[PDB]
């Protein structure tokens, strides 16, 4: 598709056998979700946003389905205002910005 | 340009007669710069994100060049970590997600 941005570019993602939705976000380095069904251990990771820094849960090599593709990437679980797919996963689906 | 996402998508902006650079941010509804010098009246706004809420000045109907292209729009001004171009401006320059 060619997604315009007259609205949030939200796509559907399948992670841990739950359908979630998240915003294709070119201004985030990483993928960050609020709650996900991921059973295993994770590592402590600090991220930066606009108001300060949050500590998040880093799960590596997670199998995830975004808009029709099965992808493997790092997925972070943190206090994000909305679910967000970052460049780590957008690159893997070949997503570019055009203008 | 077709811009890949292996690195931050940063572009030249031209605001208040200053060449600056800013991050095309599809996960931002609004546009936010570090402190710059603008004519016009401002009204205060609180904007949210990772790390919580920040108080900014909202300037209306501001002229600005993004990668050479002049567009007019609401520009927020505040103690952002980095210059951010939001969906409000990106829609004016014809910017789309592609995959």
């Amino acid at each position: 598709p060619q997604i315009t941005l007259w609205q949030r570019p939200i796509v559907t993602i399948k992670i841990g056998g739950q359908l979630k939705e998240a915003l294709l976000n070119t201004g985030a380095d990483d993928t960050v979700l609020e709650e996900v069904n991921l059973p295993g251990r994770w590592k402590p990771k600090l991220i930066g946003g606009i108001g300060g820094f949050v500590k998040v849960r880093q799960y590596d090599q997670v199998p995830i389905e975004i808009c029709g593709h099965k992808v493997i990437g790092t997925v972070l679980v943190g206090p994000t205002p909305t679910n967000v797919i970052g460049r780590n996963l957008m690159t893997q689906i070949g997503c570019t910005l055009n203008f | 340009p077709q811009i890949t996402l292996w690195q931050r998508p940063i572009v030249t902006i031209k605001i208040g007669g200053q060449l600056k650079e800013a991050l095309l941010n599809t996960g931002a509804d609004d546009t936010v710069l570090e402190e710059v010098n603008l004519p016009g009246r401002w009204k205060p706004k609180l904007i949210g994100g990772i790390g919580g809420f920040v108080k900014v000045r909202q300037y209306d109907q501001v002229p600005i060049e993004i990668c050479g292209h002049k567009v007019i729009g609401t520009v927020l001004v505040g103690p952002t970590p980095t210059n951010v171009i939001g969906r409000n401006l990106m829609t004016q320059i014809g910017c789309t997600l592609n995959f």
């Binding site: 201004g27 985030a28 946003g49 205002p81 | 936010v32």
Partner: peptide, 7 residues
């Protein structure tokens, strides 16, 4: 919302 994220 301004979902700028650095990691």
């Amino acid at each position: 919302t301004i979902m700028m994220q650095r990691g």
